[PDB]
């Protein structure tokens, strides 16, 4: 059954499908279900928080169509915001190191957004600085994906309840999610804990930057994860345990899932599926394990993931 026609492309954000894994996980392990957040029209889970953060500022009188938003971003949040801003009548300015690919640049520019490149030597510290400067000197609205409560709230209102109804009458024994901003794990974890009081909530972070585990920040290749700090949008009390995933482990899992399940997802999804399988082997046959696939592998054809 197809959705009845809509007036705006943002009206089809959410309601993402779930697929059971058949080949990458043993028959004597728990069932593993993955939620394909790349089925959102913009291609990633960030579709949800991009729309949520704009709608929140709209209901509060902070912004109105025709206004300009600015955000320091080098990932799917910029894509989601450029997507949502084009659909709802906003100007978008994004700051990022000059090291970003030309493909990523063209994607953001195709939606009509303006790009402000910062010194690559300054990484995201330079992009954050320039974003604040543009905010102050020119009056742009800064959604702040690491502090905006609409980020974990939209998962509490949509992503979570979707999973509740998708697993109606079935007990979810563990939910696992990679932590970038932390909004997915916090919003979904809160909703799932209320329904399944025995559920285990697991945070996934890069082994090369195990900040939630207590280690020091470090360079890693798990795009979308490992921000290097504790985001304000992360409920640090929501997860019962942490599972660390290495760089090559996530890549090899994504390649396996693509070739053996037909599910082509990003590197963070490989880290999520690997962690879900490890938890599925601990839980055993009969139990149920759920994780989230944030983005599609086609977005990563120019990374070592699929080259």
């Amino acid at each position: 059954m197809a959705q009845k026609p809509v007036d705006n492309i943002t009206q089809i954000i959410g309601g993402t499908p779930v697929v059971k894994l058949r080949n990458v996980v043993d028959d004597n392990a728990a069932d593993v279900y993955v939620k394909l957040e790349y089925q959102n029209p913009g291609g990633s889970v960030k579709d949800r928080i991009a729309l949520a953060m704009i709608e929140k500022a709209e209901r509060e009188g902070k912004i109105k169509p025709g206004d300009t938003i600015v955000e320091p971003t080098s990932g799917n949040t910029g894509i989601g915001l450029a997507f949502v801003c084009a659909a709802k009548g906003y100007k978008a300015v994004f700051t990022m190191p000059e090291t970003m690919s030309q493909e990523r640049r063209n994607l953001l520019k195709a939606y009509g957004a303006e790009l402000v490149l910062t010194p690559g030597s300054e990484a995201m510290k330079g992009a954050i600085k320039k974003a604040k400067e543009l905010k102050e000197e020119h009056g742009y609205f800064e959604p702040q994906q690491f502090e905006n409560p609409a980020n974990p709230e939209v998962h509490e209102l949509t992503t979570g309840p979707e999973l509740l109804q998708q697993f109606e009458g079935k007990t979810i024994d563990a939910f696992l999610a990679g932590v970038g901003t932390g909004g997915t794990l916090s919003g979904v974890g809160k909703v799932l804990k209320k329904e399944y009081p025995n559920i285990e909530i697991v945070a996934i972070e890069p082994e090369a930057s195990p900040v939630l585990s207590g280690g020091e920040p470090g360079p890693h290749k798990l795009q979308g994860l490992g921000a290097g700090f504790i985001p304000g949008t992360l409920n640090t009390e929501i997860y019962d345990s942490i599972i660390k995933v290495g760089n090559d482990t996530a890549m090899e899992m994504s390649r396996r899932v693509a070739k053996e399940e037909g599910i082509l997802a990003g590197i963070s999804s490989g880290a999520a599926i690997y962690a879900a399988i490890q938890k599925a082997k601990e839980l055993g046959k009969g139990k149920t394990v759920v994780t989230v696939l944030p983005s599609n592998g086609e977005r990563y054809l120019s990374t070592p993931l699929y080259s």
């Binding site: 949040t77 190191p97 979308g224």
Partner: peptide
């Protein structure tokens, strides 16, 4: 250190 978020 760099992220991509």
């Amino acid at each position: 250190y760099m992220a991509y978020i």
